[PDB]
Structure formats: C-alpha cells, structure tokens
Symmetry: D3
Subunit: 258 residues, 6 copies
C-alpha cells in the first residue's frame, strides 16, 4: 500500500521506487530507555520516526522500520544503564545491525540513506556500522552509496528558537534527558504517552568533567531525568517539530539532489 | 495503559517486574517480500498482534519487536535475492537476542517468551538464548526461564486445517505469503492487503535439498510459494482464535502466577 | 585409489580438480548421545558412509568430516544436558564451513555437496555457505555452486516408509536413536550397536514450543525419542540404497559432467 | 620512574601490594595534525599529563595505546588523510578490555583512562563495560575506573579567555588548533613548527555527517582551526590547570 | 572395550567420567600436502595412532580428532598455496578447542591431553585452552587441568636420533614429509605411502625471515622440506614405541589417581 | 626523523609519494624480565633495531605495539607474573590487520614487521594473512610483507661462540638472559641493573605444557637463564650483526 514506510509497501512498490535511481531511504535509530516518571520508554524511537515520516512526505523519501534497541544509556547524558526498563545492546550488536542493513540496501540497488538518530549514545556505533559497510561495498565494487547521519535535535540551533524554548537560558544537550525538548515533542505528537503531573521538579543535573564505572546511582537524580520538564508544552513541541522537519528536509535536498 | 513495555514509564515497568512473576514477550520478525498483494512487515505485524492479544489475555507485557531477521531461504521464503527483503547475518540476530535477555535479567525479570514470525529465525533465536543463559549462569543466575515458539506451530488440529485448506495441506514450507498469512492480515490489517493483486499460481515444489547461490528461476516470480486467492478474513479470525488460545494456555502452563 | 581426499597425495587431488568439473563432498556430523544401544559418533559415521558410497558411485571425492556439530536440541536429539554430547557454538561451526569453502575455492574447486547427519546443524551450515559465497564474490568468484542436504530427507517414498514403519511414521525430529538410525547402523556398523540394550518406550510427545534451560524431565531418560526395537539390518540396507540412489541422482542433476 | 614499562616486575608488584595503587592508561592515536605538528600528539599529550599527575599523587602510568579509533571529519579532519592509522572499534574496545582484565589479575583495582583522541571515547567506554561485566562473572566488583579526556578540565572562564581572547568554539573545530599546539610548544617544542601553520577561518559544518567522507569539506591542511595564536605560555597554563584538576579528581575518586 | 569416546554409548562414557580421574585425549591435526609419496591426513592419523596406544596402556579415552588445522607455513609445511591443503582461520581453530573444553567440563571431566600433529596449530590450541579456562573460572571451576603436546617432542634421546638420522639431525623445522613422518606411516599405514614416489632432494634452506604473499619458488617443488628416502618401517616402530612410552609416563606423572 | 609518529602528514605523504618507501612496525610486549630489567624490553629492542636499520636504508618506523600475546611458561616465564599485561590473540591479530589495511590506504606497499616478543609470531602472521586477503578483495595484490624476529639474524657460529663461550642452548630458554640483557646494556643502560641478576642454572622443562600455569615450574626470578655474563660489548656485537643482517635482507626483498 502506498505509504512513506517501507514496511507498509509490497516489494513491487519498493522496487518501483528504487528503480527511479535516486530514491532516498531513511532509517530511524532509537532505544528503549527510561524517561523519568512522566514519559514512556520508547520516546527515542517515536520522535525520530515522527520526524522521518514528515520529512519523507515533503521530499518524497521512504522510511525503513526503525531500530528499537540502542546502545547503553550513559550517566551524564541519559541517566545511566542501571534503571529498570532501559534495554540496551552491546556496541558490536548495534554496529552489526547497521552494517547488515546497508549491505542489504546496496543489494536492492539503493544508493542513498539517511540515518536519523534519536538516542544520544548511538552515534559512534552507527558510524562504525557505516564505515564497515562502505568498506564491504568497495570490495563488492560499489563506491556510489552515500550516507548522511544526524541526530534530529542538532537542527534546533536557532537562537530565536532556543530563547522561545528556553526563556531562562539553554544549558546544552548535555542534560536534556527527558526535559523540555523531548517532553514538548511528545506533548505535540503523543500526549496520551505523557503525564506532566508526574513531572518531578529539580535543578539541572551537574557532573564533574569525568566518568566513573561502575556507575554510581547516587550521582543521577532519582527520577532519571537530568532537567525538569515543568515548562514543556504542546506549542513548544510544534515549534521544534517544524524547525527540525524543515531543516532536515532542506539538508537532504542539498545532499541528495534529484 | 497498554501491554507494550515501550509505552510504560520505567516506574510502571519496575512495579510489574516487582510482582516477581511477571511475563515478558518479544516478537521476532523480518522485513521481507510477501508477493504482489501484501506489505513487507508481515512477519513483525502478525507475531506482534498475537503477542498483544495473548498478553492482554494473560497479563503479560510486550517488548519492542525485532524488525529485522535472518536471511530468507528459497524453499520457505522465496530467497534473499528479492528487493525490499532486508536481512541480518545470523550473528547479529543472535547477539540482539542475547543482549536483550541479559538486560531483562538485570531488571530482575525472569520469564520471557520469544514469539517468532519469520521461518529462518528459529535457530539464531535459540543460539541467542543459550549464550545468554550461559552468561547468566556465570553471573550466578539460573532461575531465568525462556519459552520460544513460532506462532503457526499452534495450528495443528485437522478440523482447523480442514477449513483453511479444503483441498490439502502441504506444510509450513510452502506457505510463504499464502492463505495462512494473507488470511491473518485480512483479519488484522486489511488496509495492508490487496487481494486483487494476488498472482494465482500452482504450488511450488522443491527437491529434498538446497542450492547456493539461490537460483531465482526456482522461485515463483511473484515471490509467493503458493496462491492466496482463497484467503479470507474469516479464515484469519479462525487462525487468530487458535493461536491466541493455544499460546495463552501454554504460557499459563509454563509461567503460573 | 580412494574417494577420501585425506587418503590422496596433493598431486592426485590436484589432477582430479584439474578436470574442471570435480565434485567434492563434506559430511557434517556430531558427537551426541544416542541412547543405551548405540555409540555417540553415529551422526558422523552415517553421513560419511553415505558420502563414501555416493562419491564412489558418481566419481566424486569426500573431504574429512566435521566431527563436532551444533548443540543437541531437546525435541530433536534429547538435549545438550547429556554427558558425552560435545557441541560447538553456532559461530564455530559456521566459521568452519566458511573456511573450508574458501580453501576449496582457492584449489580451483567449484562444486560442493554438504551432507548433514545431525538435525540441528542445517542453519549454521547455511550461514557458513552464505558468508563464504559473499567472500568469494568479493574475490571475483561467482561460479562456485553448493548443494546442502540432510540424507534422511531422501527417504520420502510412501512405499519405503511403509516397509520401515508399518504402524506409522511420526517424523524426523522424533527419530533420534530410533528405527531409522539403528537400522542403518545394523547394516553398516553392527559392532557399535546392541539391540539388547534398547529401551522400548512409547514415542516422545512434545508441545509446539521449546523451554530453556532444558528440563531433563521432558526427555526420555534413555535419551531416545522413540524405540528402535523393530530396527533391522534389512531395513538398514533398504534405507542405504534409497539414500545413495537418490543423492547420486540429485548430484548428477545439479552437477552434470 | 612512574612508568610501569620502566619498572621490574618486583618493583611493580611491591607498588600494587600497597593495596591502594592507582594506575593510569593514556589512550591516543596516530593521526594527522596539520602541516605544523607531528602525528603522535594524541599519545604525547595525555602521556605527559599522566606523568605529571602520577608524580604528584603517587600513581603509575601504563604504556600508552598508540593507535585509536578512526578520525572523523567534523572533529579530526577525516580518515582520508595520509599518515592517520586507525583501528576498528572492536580492536580498540578489545585492547582496553584485555588490559583491564590483566590489571585485575595483578590485583590492581583502580584505573584512570586518559583519552587524548576525541573519537576514542565511546569505544573506551564499551571496553570498560565489557571488562567490568567479565570481572563480575569472576567475582570481582571492587575494581573502579575513572575515564576522562584531559581537555574537559579546562572549563574555568578565566582560563578560557586567556587562551581565546576572541572567544571559544567547542572542542570540535579545535583539531590541530590553539589548545593542542600550545601544549606541544611547552612540552615538545621540537615536534612543532608553528611557522608552517596554515591560517584559515574556523571550519564550519552543517548539523550532520556525510559518508564516504568528502575531502572538500575539511580544510586542506587538515586543521579545523588556526594554531597561529598558540604559545608556550598558553601551554604552561593549560598544563598546570589540567594536572591540578585531574590530580584532585583522582584524590576524591580514589581516597587513600 | 574401545578407547574411543565416539564408539561408546553415553552411559559408558558417563560411568568412566563419573568414576573420576578420567583422562581425555584430543588429537589435533590438519588436511595438508605431504609430498608425492604420502596422503594428506597424515597429521590426523599419527597423533590419533599415538593416542590410541597410550590410552590403551594408561586407561584414557580418546576424543574424535580435529581434522582441519591452522594454515600451513612455508618454513615448516611448504606453504598454504598447495592444492589439497585445507586450513582454518586461527579464530575458528581456537574456538573449536574452547568449545570442546567447555563441554568436557560440563560432562564433569577435568583432565585433558591435547595431542598436536600439525606444526602450526600450537599457539591457536593454547589460546583455545586459555579462553576456555577463563570461562570455566567464571563458572566456578578451577580444577580442570590441560596438558598440550606435539608427539614428536618426545623423540629427544640422542641414541634414538642417531638410529634415525646417522647423517645428523637438523631440527623439526625442515622435517615435513620427511624421514620421521614417512617412517611412522610405513609402520602404521604402509598402504598410504609409496617411497617409489619420493623426490630425494636436499634439505630446504630459508633465510631468517618470512615473506607474504608466500613465494612459491622458495619451497621445494614436491612440497617436502627434506627427503624421506631413508625412511623405514623399522624406524617407525622405534619412534612409535618411544613416543608412546614417553607420553604414557608423562600422563601418569601429570594425572595421578 | 625515521619515526612516522614524529613526522607531519605532509612529510609522511611525500616519503610515500616516492612509491618505494619501506615501513617498519615494531611488535613488542609488556612482560616481566627478571629482577634485573624493566618490563618494556620487548618493545625497546625491536624499536632500537628498526631505528638503526631505517637510518641506513632510508625507511620509516611506525609506532610499535606495546602489548603482545600472552607470556608462555617455557619461553617467557608465564602469564601469572604481576606486571605482564597481555592481550588475547584476536586483539593482537586485529591490530596488525587494521594497521596493514591503513598503510595500504596510504599507498604504502612495503612493510617489515619486527617482532621482539617470542609468543607474538603466529598472531602477527594471522593478522597479515587476514589483511592480505582483504586487500585482495580490494583489488590490491602488490602489498609485500616481511616478518622477522630480530634474534633470528644472530646465527653465525663465530658470533655465538663469542656470545656463549660455555655454550649456547636456544632462544626458547633465553628469556631475560645474556642476549636481551646485553642489548639493553648497550642501548638502555639505565633500564637494567645487572647487580640484581639471580645466577641460576638454565631452566629445564619436559616436552609438554601444563595449564593452568604451574608457578613452581618457572625459576622464581622469572628468567629462564642467567644473564650474569651479559655485557655492553656483547650487546654492541649483537646490535651490529642484527642491524646489518636485516638491512641487507630488506634490500634483497625490497630492491630500490
Ligand atoms: Cl536521550
Ligand atoms: Cl515466512
Ligand atoms: Cl539426530
Ligand atoms: Cl583530536
Ligand atoms: Cl607437519
Ligand atoms: Cl621473550
Ligand atoms: Zn530520549
Ligand atoms: Zn536515549
Ligand atoms: Zn511471512
Ligand atoms: Zn519471513
Ligand atoms: Zn543421530
Ligand atoms: Zn544428532
Ligand atoms: Zn589531537
Ligand atoms: Zn585525534
Ligand atoms: Zn605432517
Ligand atoms: Zn602439518
Ligand atoms: Zn624479552
Ligand atoms: Zn616477551
């Protein structure tokens, strides 16, 4: 059935799109991770997938089934992998998954992929998956496969937007786990999966300039959040979404011209 | 408030695991061609839909499904040479299963059902289970129990088979994108099926061995191993009934409250 | 001369592959418990005997067999909890098949038959074949052909099944250390079988799912899934000729001179 | 000596026998650093910082990892450059894992990993997690690890302004810039020829990455920022700031 | 009554292991070219022959041998460029040894003798042992002991060496398909040897370094590194008794009741 | 400088641009060497030999590998000694493999691997094979590798009689003995305290190995033979013989 999601297409519909010779494919990469007492744990898959869908509808791309499990949650950016519910993969597993998928897409005749990450710690493993796959493609005689990797939040860098989102100053994505940014998007996209009343208020989380292992539960706010989402809103969610969708769409048109 | 783990907050999940008798379910599928008439995420949709109903019926939680599975085999899945089909190497599937089990044990969970919806996944899901349990044993854990199954194995009653194929069954090794799955999809996701696109062809026959590289000439052009022309919502509802009931009973038997 | 590669000098082997259409055969077995009446190397002995005879009949050569195979499954071979059974992890068996194919391709060989004698080996043998062919492709080789088979799949004639099981045939999984293998052993290695130790118990019945860790209480104590009481040298010789004939014909078809 | 490689096994054994010995492991890379610096800067710098920290707190420094993870365009220029010799992530993770396993066997239980190569981080972390998982299966849960990239200890605004009068722009476009070149000028003056620096505006990248890496998107010299204003004085400043801060972090994480 | 684990039922193996002090022996060889006069499974045949005799004298059990070994190196086996030679990657061999030790420990065995018959295998067997022992420690097992040995290292007595090479020994480096092995073969498997085919060329001379890719011209065309012209059944029986006696005593020493 | 780590990528690129440049990679280990020597001996010696050889033939030396494969009892004392820090075989193999892959990406096609740790051999060899296999898949078949253990070049009876009057015995029993100790005295005199040598008779082992390692089977000092008769003079003889032998071998295998 006609859709922007590859999973909803028959192989003939998929084949027809790739036969175009310039088809863009998008792959959401998330995680199953705790997101405080106010949001569900599949946030990292829901948000990038929602972004991909909208971008795909505007530029005419297709969206691959997203990767539901990501790399281990880090303390200073995701709370820590000691919370229950958070289910993480080892680095080699996530890399191997990205690598196999690129190898397969190349077999289909696809040559354009956008990897949209929604989980802070996935980046380097996604990157190693790309490198290893491109290496194999070369051995197979393929050097025209192009890949763009990005975390959708990096497109929200406009001062005017930042001020709107954070009237009291932005302290970097360093502590934006389950905070204003993600809660806003969820309020605008999946309100039934958020209960702002369960939001535990507390000052931003601050850590020294180093990490300790084993992780020290005490150095992470009990709720699992690194900053309060008390000021999150549907309107903020709407602004962030249009900003990301438009930025990413224009980025793709630039990198993958017809 | 659903049965999906991904839709709970960690506090809600922790509370469930806290009962000490909580049962977790994990669908393992694949992105694979399913003829001209069906979408490619059938192997994820069906076991996920079965897990949801079983979980609702017995009080279990459902983990996010594995969207990508093992390579497609010709004598059961047409072959991994079709476009769209996106398969992982066996080591990657095994490692994914193994990692998930390790994490569940860490949560304190000790009961897991793995519901496969893609033929070739089985042995790789099994190696994952074995490697994870060996690992849990090294960590001093030996009370984690796992039940693994392919939902179609629960459709054995002849009376049932009689109604689905009132002409003769030929085995789950000829039913790729045929009456069985198509009927389930018509009952569960009619918008993802278009019976008017079905390529009605005779059943495909294979010798008692496999050839590599896969020879495309030995698979029906549409990718199906048999015709889904006689598929229907009613057959789908019959199958669903049977699967949910049988699997639900099996879990009550293996994981008593 | 001999059909076993191991018993040839490199010069003879080289001359054989130099013909450009030489067929090679590799038996893949296992060291697994086979009840109170049979030895544990059955899974290697049988496929090797079949390859030997098939190879001699059609002019192929046989590679040293793989003595260790994948983990024994409960509903297939009793379970990997038994003493004696010595299994490899999936990646290990896969890597072995993959390395051997790579080497054969280096020799100039382009035709291989993998004959499995242990139920659970299949998928790992398949993954080994796939990863090998992927590599050969990177090396610019796409003319290497492989045929994988389990020798018991050629015994599918109702007339033969009837002569073997008048009372009825349940399947290949429940045939662990039963009439089939014991009959072949009586005709091939009678000194390694003792019918007097056979435990004549009813056929093992299993639910449509697997439980892990394996529960010993669910597998017949002797390790067999069905009685080999009615086994015989006569049945064994019938099985052997059907298997050798069928496999030799398949090879001649897949690998014409 | 504070370096393990310069001790006999008996001297090393005696030190760890104290029961509270802290070991340090520099993790660098062989990577291009512009026309003005040699390629082993990522090894030299953390090793120099470790040596000085160890001398002040009584720790030991392990031989440094000479090879690190693949250089990334937006933070290191890209792995398409000559000279840069990178390991696959699994190779680096495994090396870190093996070393931690061996140290646990010696009886050591305190390790500080000082990274000097940006992209090494996530792979050093995985190496730590896999090793600790192993140590747990072995019945060891008292092995503690502190991991850090020495440049993160330079966060005091007073210091930043003295290093960057015009302003600062994150440790991304720093590759081969002021920070590193200034340290080399103070520690290894003969391995840096500032006269060969190629002045150019700080590299700007869009909020995404492209593979295969496009050579045209990295400044020709391989630097992401100009080292023109780097100096020995800035070097001495950075050095003392990092040595003191890290020495104190270690005292708190690993009290005697 | 046999000493081969493969020829026992699982109940027989279980009794021997449960009896305690059971010593298992595992031959590790290779499929490798051995000149114009010998077959290619020599490296499996010899250590297996030695294990058999030792096990019969000391009451040990011998496991199915590893048929494929590590890549052949020029300065010791001619080079992995010859046809017939079928080598495994190091990790595959290491993993196979690790898996078997893990399983023997599960059976309850705690004593193992790895008898190597292929020069290049040694370090990969060692890593296998180490990775396996590390794993056993995680499992709480620290009383599993392993002895690894190349059977030729037991032929050290000057007297014996004089009777074998009256012209002067020259180390095992240049001893491939030469007098030592060809003699053991004449005494154990004369059928697989044909001295008439021996190429009496002088010992191979190599520089103190190795080159890759291997240069074919630096290895004697026959594949042997020394002539086996002076090999004899007599020499074979001498070496055999020497190795058997030495290995037997060594085992009694390392594995006391 | 002959050290790649000391060159800028521009310098390195120019040298490789010649199209006949020879690279050399020292492969060592962090391993106990008795009571009289430091533990980085296996890295220091091959690196020292490479430096001298490279200066004579105009080659370049890559950063050496600091950690090698596990120490074996009958040749290195045993991996049970404190201080010895070994990698698993897969890790060392992967390291060699990755480096070769990168040198190929550079355009280099000539590599000399100089092993200074007895137990590294087979894993270095497997790394090379895996690398060449992969290079073949990339359409590259003109990459040539020479592997060697520097001690294999001291084969002249005249040199041996001169080094071991009372008789030689074999590299397997040489761990921390006269050979390595003499080289250290001539090259790194500050890292060796001959006065700490334990003068015990050569070690004797049966023709087999036992695992787990039995500590009682290794001389207590960790040495397999006495270095009491080691000297700076002997070291200079060894060094010149090795340097000249390797230099000439490299000329024959990698002709100008
Ligand atoms: Cl996050
Ligand atoms: Cl299917
Ligand atoms: Cl079976
Ligand atoms: Cl950097
Ligand atoms: Cl040999
Ligand atoms: Cl040594
Ligand atoms: Zn999130
Ligand atoms: Zn996240
Ligand atoms: Zn399906
Ligand atoms: Zn499927
Ligand atoms: Zn069997
Ligand atoms: Zn079996
Ligand atoms: Zn740097
Ligand atoms: Zn760097
Ligand atoms: Zn041999
Ligand atoms: Zn050999
Ligand atoms: Zn040494
Ligand atoms: Zn050493």
């Amino acid at each position: 059935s006609k859709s922007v999601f590859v999973g909803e297409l028959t192989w003939k519909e998929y084949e027809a799109r790739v036969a175009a010779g310039d088809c863009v494919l998008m792959l959401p990469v998330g995680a199953l991770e705790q997101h405080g007492h106010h949001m569900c744990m599949n946030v990292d898959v829901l948000l990038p997938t929602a972004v991909c869908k909208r971008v795909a509808e505007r530029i005419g791309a297709l969206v691959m089934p997203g990767l539901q499990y990501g790399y281990k949650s880090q303390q200073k950016s995701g709370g820590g992998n000691h919370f229950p519910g958070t289910t993480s993969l080892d680095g080699a597993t996530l890399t191997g998954t990205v690598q196999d998928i690129i190898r397969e897409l190349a077999r289909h005749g696809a040559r354009r992929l956008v990897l949209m990450n929604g989980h802070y710690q996935n980046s380097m493993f996604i990157v190693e998956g790309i490198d290893l796959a491109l290496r194999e493609l070369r051995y197979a005689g393929i050097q025209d496969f192009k890949v763009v990797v990005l975390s959708y939040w990096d497109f929200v860098k406009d001062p005017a937007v930042i001020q709107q989102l954070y009237p009291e100053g932005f302290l970097g994505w360093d502590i934006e786990h389950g905070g204003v940014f993600e809660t806003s998007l969820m309020l605008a996209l999946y309100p039934d999966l958020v209960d702002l009343d369960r939001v535990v208020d507390h000052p931003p989380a601050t850590f020294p300039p180093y990490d300790v292992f084993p992780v020290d539960p005490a150095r992470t706010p009990a709720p699992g959040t690194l900053s309060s989402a008390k000021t999150a809103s549907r309107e903020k969610g709407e602004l962030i979404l249009e900003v990301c969708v438009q930025g990413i769409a224009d980025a793709i048109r630039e990198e993958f011209p017809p």
